[PDB]
Write an enzyme that holds these catalytic residues in place. Structure first.
Site, short mmCIF file in Angstrom:
data_model
loop_
_atom_site.label_atom_id
_atom_site.label_comp_id
_atom_site.label_asym_id
_atom_site.label_seq_id
_atom_site.Cartn_x
_atom_site.Cartn_y
_atom_site.Cartn_z
N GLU A 1 21.25 0.18 40.18
CA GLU A 1 21.50 0.38 41.60
C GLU A 1 22.51 -0.63 42.14
OE1 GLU A 1 17.99 0.44 44.07
OE2 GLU A 1 19.12 -0.35 45.78
N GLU B 1 8.16 -7.76 47.95
CA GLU B 1 7.81 -6.50 47.30
C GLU B 1 6.63 -6.66 46.33
OE1 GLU B 1 11.17 -4.53 45.63
OE2 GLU B 1 12.46 -4.88 47.38
N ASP C 1 22.94 2.57 46.91
CA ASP C 1 22.14 2.14 48.05
C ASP C 1 23.03 1.74 49.22
OD1 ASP C 1 20.26 1.21 49.83
OD2 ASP C 1 19.90 -0.68 48.76
N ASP D 1 18.68 -3.56 40.23
CA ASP D 1 19.17 -3.47 41.60
C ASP D 1 20.13 -4.63 41.82
OD1 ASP D 1 19.72 -3.20 44.26
OD2 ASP D 1 17.67 -3.53 44.97
N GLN E 1 19.56 -8.75 42.06
CA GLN E 1 18.52 -8.90 43.07
C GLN E 1 17.13 -8.48 42.59
OE1 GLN E 1 19.27 -7.98 47.24
NE2 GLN E 1 17.46 -6.64 47.29
N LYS F 1 16.74 6.07 52.12
CA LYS F 1 15.98 5.26 53.06
C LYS F 1 15.86 5.98 54.39
CE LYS F 1 17.19 0.79 50.99
NZ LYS F 1 17.86 -0.53 51.21
N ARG G 1 11.20 -0.38 52.18
CA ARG G 1 11.95 -1.49 52.76
C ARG G 1 11.25 -2.81 52.49
NH1 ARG G 1 16.25 0.49 55.63
NH2 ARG G 1 16.97 -1.62 55.09
N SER G 2 11.98 -3.92 52.63
CA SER G 2 11.41 -5.24 52.40
C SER G 2 10.27 -5.52 53.37
CB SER G 2 12.50 -6.32 52.52
OG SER G 2 13.07 -6.31 53.81
N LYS H 1 10.86 4.58 44.71
CA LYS H 1 10.99 3.14 44.65
C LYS H 1 10.20 2.53 45.80
CE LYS H 1 14.47 -0.55 44.79
NZ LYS H 1 15.84 -0.88 45.26
#
Lengths: 428, 428, 428, 428
Positions: free
Chosen positions: C287, C202, C314, C240, C160, C339, C368-369, C390
């Site tokens: 990740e 991102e 995650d 990730d 990803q 998160k 977050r996205s 991150k």
């Protein structure tokens, strides 16, 4: 803002691992005061214990704590933080009992001290300044527990305590050093004799000496090893006979602690025995040399030693103005040991001090076997220019906290600071 | 107004009658903070002593005090009271030496703690809140000294300290209660056996036992006498071998304390002796089980017990991050004893705590032999959620002062307070 | 004055054009705090959506806003702004559900953050200082998204995300420049190949590469074109995988994104495939290399790469202390992606961070996205000395807002600032 | 206390990963304001760049920062934070050049916005209130970028920007919602056609369409897909031809972007092409339809469309009051794009807005390609009741930050908030 808005108490431990309490007082302006209570007859203030022998051997103080939060708090909140006398009288009336047995003498005092410290905090002045005014200057000459006996020892010695007094130090700071250096010089001596150097409640030693004289003469040895004298600077010695411990009928039984060959003395022989010690050793003060109820013995003792030796009444007066007032009229002694929690409030504590003053008696601010990190009695000692204090040996924070606080006071006073040394005993 | 406008230090005494120092920091706003210092090989922070045995046998601290008032003061005054790191870093740079031997580790820590407490006073927040932020809830599981040996006793026992840990207590409040009750229960037992009940520096006992085992079982005897199990609630036991006290070549000579018939063990035989004790008694922690320079011994010791018993490095790490980093790398131990004045500053103190945490090591904030009425290490324990603390026995105020502060911290937290008990050992 | 007097929420948009919420907290003294929430299994915090597919595709947050104003507000107003832990626990209890599904995980967090920022505002201290105390110094080493794949791309690539980490920069300021210059050097390279240089959520690229290796080797090309190395300073690379995206039974199907010739790997071949990438490329962190439920695969992966590569959990831990506690006991990974909104509160966020610390795991503060102009996660990264963060690529304010905030922090810290670089991975 | 006591600038990054600067102004009273700067022919304000491509390819801004800290600071410190005009005039005089090229337009604007926001903080009033007074109620009608062409795309389209305007929205809150819904609806359509959905600098798309018309109709296709009409509520469309990008001699060469078969049009043929689009599609505004130096083209363009369509001069006026005054005199256009950093100061900014208003021209506060998390242009739009704003698409936070602030402003106004929608164009 100056009004008290919060009065809260909690359970804590004393210097013996036993439960006590402390009270915190808040004003709406932010002034804060915390008061801790030391450990605590039929005519003296009584501390409130839980009695639950399954919690802390029945020495809990949750009942007393509850009385502060759920009863006294509602009564005190609203008072100006500075109205000490009114607040104390309010708690005395609230309790009802003479001995403060309903609310507890420990619950009452905790608030008494916290309120005063909160007030001194509010006015941004030292505690001793708030308690005594602008004319507080006299740092107390300390009688320092160094050797124990009687109930506080396994050694063949009858007297409960043996103390040293730096009567010839130029200031308190030097006097504290003198006592310390002798304490370490004694520890060294005790090790040499292969004796125990571990300390008891007051931070003093309790070694197996041969007897009273062996104990006193060993103290005299440590004083001299430190590079001092014995009477001049001096260092002089004091007693806490606690004669009520070994008093029987109408006889002072020494076989109770000193062994089979020990002597059983009457009131007359007890006075003579004390006179022999004073004449042979540099003794300046004697506490509870006679039974708490032996009034006749106290009078005859004062006639024969009262002019040249300090006679402190501890269990004899139990910080009671009624017992002291009779002591003055009868001429039973010439000094009183002031124990704050033994009376209940700070107001009552200062009326006892003043009464002793106006009578020619000295007031020796006392500590308890169970102390805390509180050092209020030091501020009280300077607040009233008592000139004397009794707050333990030289090896425990429960004791050193008070000597530390006196160092700060003497430092705050500056050139104004006064150390009377031998002149602390105006009763002679 | 948050600016430091005054830094002042004076000489005082610790819990042993030896000189130390305290520092008072003032801000323009009127905020006040006082930081007292406890007493303190070649790679650690050293305290400055006067060296004049005409005063306190050369243990005077008027030099370190002068350094604070005349040198450190000019440097710190002007700083914001809240810039802790910058202030500690300035004192380190000011000193110029690694061991803080020029200004004195005692002089630097004094200002370090004073500034912190003054900043907490200015922000009107609890010290532990200021030190650690908002997430401070964990009340430490106490390892309480109860029996002493080695150099701190005359009994034939090599181990220096023996401790009890209330791992199965629901809260710190009940944990403290359990420790006290076992301490009183043990005192009773000692008098029944005709042994000394006088306390030492840490408020613990040093009775003349038959040997090491007799001591451990007498503890278990008192634990059960208080109505507690032995290992479940627990009470559990801990060691402080201080094996660097009887180490030689390359052998652990036990005859140094345990008579002529004692067993001289090698590193391999040392680990074996410790493992036997762990399997025979409910022991949960062992401090300095190996020589401070026996790294190969520490590595093998952690291999055979490091997963089931806490191994505390005191003299092995001497609160030195360079030593700890090596111990973490070699897997030499799994816990470090944190002595504040052994490292100089609070900043350096919290860096060691964090380095230990991130490595899975526990950080045990420790007291010293010479303590004061200060109780900052209690706030340090909660501020970092360390989960453990070592601050003495259940008697002297130099020890109880820290326990009382922990009770106040647990009281302030309320429903947020957390006592991990046995879970405190995340290193297991 | 320190009491919270107002708690208000409103609907706003995130960095994706989708509705979110923000909470503003006021104190009677004037202290202000605003908290914005990012976009947000069966055991994780759930955000509250309106579900009205006619307003913002059913992504409205008016229900959540109402819960803050009409429910949570009445519950929080009255609390001291500084009692973070109490306020968070009050919201958790108010909701009732484990996942905060009644009030909404987004409604709860918004207040959680606003209250903390309002408190930091009240005490006039930086947010990170309030959250972490006085010992906050470590600026995080950033893993910066640079190339996308899987669900976030049309390219034949399974992983990803592909990130770069400036592990060898002397400070954060330089590390940020390094990542930026490589981002622009890559954009130049992508244009050369006639590929797309527009950015995704991102701010990273998602070009049509030939596959995973073509993508990674192109990154390595941009790193070198910028005038850096590949492993030393380094710049190193991270993954990730989001392997749960293409996990089937018990097979990691790569044909899902990489095409017809792609490989379908078991848990064992998946571990080997990751080991080949680490050995061939300068990879330092991975990740979600294994499915969220493939615990056995996670353990075997940690045994074979955990000592030399960071393994971030995650979707595996979903910021859940229960999932992480099992990860530690099982030794399933060595790092956790934190998160904030995935757990609900700031308190829970810091307990997850500490737990990971005490276990040797690193905590990587995540974004977050769907982000906002908020930069709280930066203060959290420094507040806990996480050493890693991150927060996206180098071409979107929803990402650059966090790097900007870290620049201010590093500027505020001064000489106290710390950049561990490669040393951020203490879990190796 | 309202006196500026500190002006400090630092280097940061914008939404493209390129260096910019932010300025923080402090007053003695404790008021704080931070002003960030966006990225920025021969007659405009120029930003100062370092020119050191060893850092950010020469895009460093440490020079302009130094100018603020070392030169502008000495000049501004002492001023009252509320004397905006005097402070901006002082910086202009300090620089000495028309283009602010000595100190840097970025350095001067930074202080300009910082002082304003600090003054609004001191007076405790919303920025837009401080900037425009009490009569600030109009929420701008947004022209939202959605499709890009020309230099910002690879598709065969000459026009640089395409925008949607919710002219028929009842409020700004619903207008923003409509834009977002059309943006999401369009994203869907692009994926169905197999076109790139990755966003550009402004958060808009740049799909490979068949041509200009295909782009406009695909927008209308999405507008109707979202459930909105096309021109009534509206949604209406807008252009940013940037015809100065493909202008030559004296011809508008379309082959520069639209392949070899594109139509090279003259000024007369250019106006004709624009008129056809207006009559075929619901277009309401056109920016830079003519070359920046084609004044004769602008005059004839305003003659044939100036009464029915908004003609925005961006490069034609470059926020230059001397250019605008000429355009107003010649009737060259009927709207000016206001770029804050293109003119240096806020004072100069509001003078251009007013000059435009008094001439019947609309003032469209604009964003830049390189933006920050700042949202001052939103307060500038409401403060002047401009009625319009151009601040990007519906994705990136560098764009959404401004939309969120407008929501807060509309929320604060309550019943006083006003959305003119189509009536915003008083120039028609």
């Amino acid at each position: 803002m100056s009004i008290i808005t919060d009065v809260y108490a909690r359970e804590v431990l004393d210097s013996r691992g036993n439960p006590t309490l402390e009270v915190e007082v808040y004003t709406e302006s932010g002034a804060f005061g915390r008061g801790m209570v030391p450990s605590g007859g039929e005519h003296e203030a009584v501390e409130l214990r839980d009695g639950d022998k399954s919690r802390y051997l029945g020495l809990g103080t949750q009942k007393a704590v509850d009385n502060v939060n759920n009863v006294i708090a509602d009564a005190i909140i609203g008072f100006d933080v500075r109205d000490q006398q009114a607040i104390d009288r309010a708690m005395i009336a609230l309790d009802g009992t003479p001995n403060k047995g309903k609310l507890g003498a420990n619950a009452i005092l905790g608030v008494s001290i916290a309120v005063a410290r909160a007030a001194a905090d509010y006015l941004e002045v030292p505690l001793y300044t708030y308690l005594g005014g602008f004319n507080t200057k006299v740092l107390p000459t300390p009688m320092m527990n160094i050797i124990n006996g009687g109930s506080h020892s396994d050694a063949p010695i009858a007297f409960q305590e043996f103390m040293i007094l730096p009567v010839g130090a130029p200031s308190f700071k030097e006097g504290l050093r003198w006592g310390a250096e002798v304490f370490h010089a004694l520890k060294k001596i005790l090790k040499a004799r292969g004796l125990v150097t571990a300390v008891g409640d007051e931070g003093g030693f309790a070694p197996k000496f041969e007897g009273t004289e062996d104990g006193v003469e060993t103290i005299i040895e440590a004083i001299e090893a430190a590079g001092y004298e014995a009477g001049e600077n001096g260092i002089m010695i004091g007693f806490d006979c606690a004669s009520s411990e070994f008093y029987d009928r109408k006889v002072y039984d020494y076989t109770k602690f000193e062994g089979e060959g020990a002597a059983v003395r009457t009131s007359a022989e007890q006075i003579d025995y004390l006179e022999e010690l004073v004449n042979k050793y540099p003794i300046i003060t004697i506490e509870d040399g006679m039974d708490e109820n032996d009034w006749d013995g106290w009078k005859a003792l004062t006639e024969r030693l009262g002019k040249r030796v300090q006679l402190v009444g501890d269990d004899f007066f139990v910080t009671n103005t009624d017992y002291l007032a009779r002591g003055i009229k009868e001429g039973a002694a010439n000094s009183i040991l002031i124990k704050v929690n033994q009376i209940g409030t700070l107001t009552e504590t200062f009326e006892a001090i003043e009464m002793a003053k106006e009578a020619g008696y000295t007031a020796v601010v006392s500590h308890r076997s169970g102390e805390t990190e509180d050092s209020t009695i030091a501020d009280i000692a300077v607040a009233t220019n008592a000139g004397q204090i009794k707050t333990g040996s030289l090896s425990r924070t429960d004791r050193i906290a008070k000597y530390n606080q006196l160092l700060r006071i003497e430092d705050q006073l500056g050139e104004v600071a006064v150390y009377k040394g031998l002149n602390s005993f105006y009763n002679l």
